[PDB]
Design a binder for this molecule. Structure first.
Ligand SMILES: NC(=O)C1=CN([C@@H]2O[C@H](COP(=O)(O)OP(=O)(O)OC[C@H]3O[C@@H](n4cnc5c(N)ncnc54)[C@H](OP(=O)(O)O)[C@@H]3O)[C@@H](O)[C@H]2O)[C@@H](O)[C@@H](O)C1
Ligand SMILES: NC(=O)C1=CN([C@@H]2O[C@H](COP(=O)(O)OP(=O)(O)OC[C@H]3O[C@@H](n4cnc5c(N)ncnc54)[C@H](OP(=O)(O)O)[C@@H]3O)[C@@H](O)[C@H]2O)[C@@H](O)[C@@H](O)C1
Ligand SMILES: [Zn+2]
Lengths: 390, 390
């Protein structure tokens, strides 16, 4: 096994966790700040969560911007960038799921970006030239992405069919309110999506090259084990507080930097999946459920050791040849996704694979030609993975 | 099974981890600052670490203060506090173990304390009235306490036989340099002490009362499993980087706030142990190895469920009655400490238990009369625990 690489870990986001944790929200925002509350397509109005937020900040200088959609659009967000500049917003409060949080991270950085440069430049450069951003916090209504306490975001330009990520410490939220009760109203589709996303985030940082990082491994395995136990329960028992709190906390811990610090990371499943969302409109987690089992089969030898550890530690699979244990672990993973209600073949979404050449052209356009922890997933390999996922 | 309590988790310490991670040190400290490098009895001069730190901060306005011995003494630290006030120090850099870091946390707070109040008041109030402190960073040479990325400190006043803790967010280090290579020089005694302290920190937050916090449980179990595997290897292979890296990271993750957030915590072993260090001079971890097995036997009824989970998850103990399993778990724990070279009976250290009445007087003086997660360890229970530890 290889060793940990040197790392620099900073996890500054203050977490306010639990039932009624919104009581601590007002405290976190500077009293003289001009706050823009961002939110999504309207679920927060129906549930009363937006009203709770507005009441927490009663008397403060508050504006609202609604309409940030799943796979948040540059086209949507430029409206808020204009508003933020013209109204001199000095603090952003994101209320919703990962799309709302990510859209708000983009607004935060875009507002301070050089005036004469199209802020889509952030996505073309992965956020490396971001020098500052408007501070933000969040109230998370959907556990999936860990965006509440990480420095990443995924923004789409819908006109041209691009879905790309950026990263910058400047868009790391100052705080996050995590109240499991706010997740009770999630449609099961989204509950399942969130369990899958947290699961896949974990394996992107854990089912990789073997490194003797025992805490990282145990923590990753712990998240996976918890999602397998309580994920399905969150569908059967939607208002079980303990179950929903376990899922919410698992999703946070899957991508705040801790389990990936100094260890090789894959992300190929994510990169391949992004193109499926961009071209075909599939939910982010749906694309991962399709790509992951096909990718793991294709990459079963570079990933042999960690697939075998995963098989044993997460699924209690120990018997047979390495090939048999890996087949069984992949099958168990596919079944887990399917049983959550997340199908794992392109044909389940009415896609026959004729779009694969077009997806590869988009991968190439986006510089996704040497994917994976070994930088060995070329366009011919990506073609084979997509083909296997039909 | 009970539920998670609401919590407020903030872990702001930047971690610079790995071989030669001191190359990131200079960047962290403000150029304009007047830095006081604090250190211990002299090992840092002998090894070469203090020179690496001075080399890293070459040209900057630095001062030095050595002499902070294990169980950092109020008398010594007040000499540092006077130096900090006279020289207008604006930043502290602790280079050493937990005693050095903790002593520096006290210097940081006591220096800003009201001039006409004895800053030992900090320990009388547990740090509750601390309004500010001089910012600090650290370079850790001994993994044990997790003090590098927590807001706690334990100071001794040798004059009056006191060893007491304070807590304040103001003494949380801005950064911590964690280079496993610096731990290679640790005497076996201190390697063992660190493994034990990390182990006990974890069980203080985990072997309590059953709460359905699955991530907390898996993470705590993960630290414990890792310390059992690689702790003995750190003695046998002192220069094995991967092994030393696993132990160092485990100790960090054992007390940064993560695994204890919203869950019941015990700390009774620590409170009873502090009085053994103050009275008899035992290393902190030696006092924990003595007290823990005795306390668990005494509290086997209230701790039943988590002792059984501990037994299964950490020691693979599944067969037999509940009492047989608990006995085997306690026995396994005791053996583990002993095989690290840390005896678990007072008589192993030449203490016959005649000091127990005097220990109870000190516990009473310090308000340690209703200890444990159920606040039910009274002085007569503490007597019973000490007596069983003979
Ligand atoms: N920042 C990051 O590090 C990452 C972000 N990712 C990105 O995150 C986005 C997905 O975020 P999610 O949190 O999964 O979901 P969305 O925010 O899109 O929301 C999905 C739907 O759920 C609904 N919803 C959210 N909270 C609800 C509530 N409690 N009650 C009822 N409905 C609720 C939303 O409905 P509304 O828009 O009406 O609010 C939305 O349709 C995708 O765009 C994905 O690419 C991922 O790529 C991830 O891998 C990495
Ligand atoms: N801040 C906190 O959260 C807590 C701190 N605790 C407190 O922490 C203190 C113990 O700290 P540790 O890190 O275990 O050890 P110390 O700092 O006292 O040092 C012990 C000896 O180790 C030696 N040492 C440290 N780094 C070395 C190196 N790498 N090479 C060779 N020798 C080295 C030290 O020798 P020197 O003084 O010459 O430097 C010391 O004698 C005790 O006073 C304890 O009460 C604990 O109570 C803990 O439970 C919680
Ligand atoms: Zn301790």
């Amino acid at each position: 096994k290889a060793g940990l690489n040197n790392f620099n870990l900073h996890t500054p986001t203050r977490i306010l966790f639990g039932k009624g944790a919104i009581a601590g929200l007002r405290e976190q925002i500077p009293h003289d700040a001009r706050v823009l509350i961002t939110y999504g397509g309207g679920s927060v109005k129906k549930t009363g969560v937006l009203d709770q937020v507005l009441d927490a900040l009663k008397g403060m200088d508050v504006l609202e911007f609604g309409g940030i959609e799943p796979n948040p659009a540059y086209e949507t967000l430029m409206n808020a960038v204009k508003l933020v500049r013209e109204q001199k917003v000095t603090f952003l409060l994101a209320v919703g799921g990962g799309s709302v949080l990510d859209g708000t991270k983009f607004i935060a950085a875009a507002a301070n970006y050089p005036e004469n440069i199209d802020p889509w430049h952030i996505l073309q450069t992965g956020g490396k030239e971001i020098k500052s951003a408007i501070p933000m916090g969040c109230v998370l209504t959907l556990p999936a992405t860990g965006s509440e306490s990480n420095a990443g975001a995924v923004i789409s330009r819908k006109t041209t069919g691009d879905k790309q990520a950026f990263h910058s410490a400047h868009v790391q939220p100052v705080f996050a309110v995590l109240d499991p009760v706010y997740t009770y109203t999630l449609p099961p589709r989204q509950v399942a999506n969130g369990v899958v996303d947290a699961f896949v985030h974990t394996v992107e940082q854990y089912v990789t090259k073997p490194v003797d990082a025992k805490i990282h491994d145990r923590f990753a395995e712990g998240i996976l084990l918890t999602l397998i136990e309580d994920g399905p329960k969150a569908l059967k028992e939607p208002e079980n507080y303990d179950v929903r709190a376990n899922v919410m906390w698992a999703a946070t811990q899957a991508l705040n930097g801790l389990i990936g610090a100094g260890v090789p990371q894959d992300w190929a499943t994510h990169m391949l999946g992004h193109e499926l969302t961009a071209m075909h409109g599939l939910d982010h987690a749906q694309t991962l459920a399709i790509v992951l089992p096909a990718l793991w089969n294709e990459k079963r030898d570079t990933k042999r050791a960690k697939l075998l550890q995963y098989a044993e530690r997460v699924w209690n699979i120990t018997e047979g040849s390495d090939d048999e244990r890996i087949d069984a672990a992949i099958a168990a993973t596919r079944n887990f996704f399917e049983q959550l209600g997340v199908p794992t073949h392109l044909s389940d979404y009415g896609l026959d694979g004729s779009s694969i050449p077009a997806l590869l052209k988009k991968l190439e356009e986006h510089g996704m030609t040497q994917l994976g922890e070994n930088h060995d997933i070329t366009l011919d390999v990506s073609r084979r993975i997509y083909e296997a996922a039909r």
